[PDB]
Amino acid sequence: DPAALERLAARYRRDGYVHVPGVLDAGEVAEYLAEARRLLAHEESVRWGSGAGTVMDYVADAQLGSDTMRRLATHPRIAALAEYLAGSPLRLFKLEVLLKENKEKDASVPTAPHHDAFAFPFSTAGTALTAWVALVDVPVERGCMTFVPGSHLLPDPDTGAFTRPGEIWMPRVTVPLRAGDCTFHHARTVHSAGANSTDEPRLSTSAVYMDATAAYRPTGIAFLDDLPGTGADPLREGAPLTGDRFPLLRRPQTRQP
């Protein structure tokens, strides 16, 4: 339905995020969920901690070690939506598997407000977008996300969420999601997430898509600049991000009238 897709894109452009229900069917959800659980339990994950406590555990670059996650990262429907929303051809940058849950003596805490762009070591960071796919039901209390609509159109912080003049006065929209729903959000959209205050883990994936012309651009933060699976040598500033490691979401056409 091209009309509903136009409306959806227009919402994305105006707000800086959009909710898309039922992007995965029930079987797909049950497949990706199992693989998410398997990876978290049997492979390496990374703790995102703060003084406040545990923000989350995640499997980094999950697509590199798991085909099943790569299929999700390049899912045809998700990819097609992303490209339509972005308005250009895209490449995959990374997929992560995200877990928020309460453990013994380790309570889940919120994800503090931020925007994603400044942590992206590539040239088109400012127009990147993220697909966050719910693999279980994520009501408010299980730590769904909140977005500040229009915040992607604000100028740069002079550093920085909620630092620009008037920004604190801007309304915020909390978006609970059913299993198999996703959101897309722009790299400049301010977003946060609640603590998981339930007994059921919050499980999802988050995939970052970038302009197909993206080039390497170090942030100067070692941890963000070091891209696994890109060869022995560090990457040079300006180096294009291409190939299997940063795949095009849509096969480029050889066939033309």
Ligand X SMILES: O=C(O)CCC(=O)C(=O)O
| Gyration radius of the chain's alpha carbons | 18
Size of the site for ligand X (CB under 6 A): 9
- Please identify, using beta-carbon distances, which residue of 8 and 193 lies nearer to ligand X: 193
- Please identify, using beta-carbon distances, which residue of 207 and 214 lies nearer to ligand X: 207
- From the list 46, 79, 29, the residue with the least C-alpha distance to 204 is 29
Tell me if 111 is assigned to a ligand binding site. Answer: yes
- Measure Cα distances from 252 to 34, 74, 131, 140, 255 in Å: 32, 14, 22, 40, 9
Mapped onto helix, strand or coil, the DSSP state of residue 159 is coil
CB of 131 to Fe ion, least distance (A): 12
- Selection from ligand X, Fe ion, none that 98 binds (CB < 5 to 8 A by kind) is ligand X
Residues 89-118 that bind Fe ion (CB under 5 A): 116
Give CA–CA dist 154/138, Å, rounded.
Answer: 29
The pairing of beta strand 111-114 with beta strand 90-100: unpaired
CB of 125 to ligand X, least distance (A): 12
* Residues facing residue 185 across a β-bridge: 17, 130
- Please identify, using beta-carbon distances, which residue of 24 and 56 lies nearer to Fe ion: 56
Residues 35-64 that bind ligand X (CB under 6 A): 56
CB of 199 to Fe ion, least distance (A): 25
CB of 114 to Fe ion, least distance (A): 6
CB half-sphere exposure, 29, CA atoms < 13 A:
18
In 3-state terms, the chain is what percent helix, strand and coil (to 5)?
30, 25, 45
- From the list 28, 21, 18, 20, the residue with the least C-alpha distance to 135 is 28
Residues 118-157 that bind ligand X (CB under 6 A): 130, 132
- Please identify, using beta-carbon distances, which residue of 1 and 199 lies nearer to ligand X: 199
CB of 254 to ligand X, least distance (A): 35
- Measure Cα distances from 80 to 63, 72, 89, 186, 231 in Å: 18, 13, 10, 16, 29
- From the list 246, 245, 248, 208, the residue with the least C-alpha distance to 89 is 248
CB of 191 to Fe ion, least distance (A): 6
Task: Fill in the per-residue mask, 177 to 206: x = in contact with ligand X (CB under 6 A), - = not in contact.
Answer: --------------x-x------------x
| Binding test (CB under 6 A) with ligand X, winner from 35, 116, 181, 211 | 116
Size of the site for Fe ion (CB under 5 A): 1
Q: Which residues are annotated as a binding site?
A: 111, 114, 116, 132, 185, 191, 202, 206
Q: Which residues are annotated as a binding site for 2-oxoglutarate?
A: 111, 132, 185, 202, 206
Q: Which residues are annotated as a binding site for succinate?
A: 111, 132, 202, 206
